[PDB]
Structures are given as C-alpha cells and as structure tokens.
Amino acid sequence: MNDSEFHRLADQLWLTIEERLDDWDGDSDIDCEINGGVLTITFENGSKIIINRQEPLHQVWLATKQGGYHFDLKGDEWICDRSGETFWDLLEQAATQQAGETVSFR
C-alpha cells in the first residue's frame, strides 16, 4: 500500500467510526474520544476499545478487552492479519460484549 492511499482509507475509517459512535443512541452510555489521533471508546463498566494507525505498516490496530487485532486493506476492506476476520465484525463483537447491548452498524 502506498502512504497516500493509507492516509485516504484510514481517514475514511476514522470518520465512519466517529460518526457511528457519536451517533449511538442505545440504552448504554458509550463515549468515543480522539487523542493524539488515537480513538478510545469507553463503556459504562470502565472497559475500553482503542483504535490506532500504524503508519510504517499501513495497518489499523484494534485493542479490546479480549485481545489485539492488526488489519491490512484487502479487497476494499480491513482484514485481520492473523484470522482474516473483518474490522467491523471484530469491533461490533467487542463493543457488544463490552456494552452488554447489541452494538451493530450493518
């Protein structure tokens, strides 16, 4: 991947995460903040999900209560380099588990 394409696609992903989380209107209180470019989602139980860019690798990284997941862009989608699972599936699964309420943007 080249650096400019990474900037373009990561910017897009950042906007999508921010809008989806800032627009959340379910029962649970969920907050999302951007600090030093890093997104942190905080849940009522104190747990968090952290999303950051790894520029030299052209990857997006995800840290949840359960684990860590590193993503490459493959065929127009962010895909975990260890399992093949998609960024949005892993993020939704973790946010649903950590909020105790369905967090779904599909």
Automatic annotation (TrEMBL):
Signal peptide: none
Keywords, alphabetical: Iron, Metal-binding
Source species, domain of life: Bacteria
An example molecular function term from Gene Ontology annotations: ferric iron binding
GO annotation, cellular component aspect: cytosol
Gene Ontology biological process terms, A to Z: iron-sulfur cluster assembly
PANTHER family attached to this UniProt entry: FRATAXIN, FRATAXIN, MITOCHONDRIAL
Function: Involved in iron-sulfur (Fe-S) cluster assembly. May act as a regulator of Fe-S biogenesis.
NCBIfam families: FeS_CyaY (TIGR03421)
Family per record: Belongs to the frataxin family.
Protein name as it appears in the record: Iron-sulfur cluster assembly protein CyaY
Lineage, uppermost ranks: Bacteria, Pseudomonadati, Pseudomonadota, Gammaproteobacteria, Enterobacterales
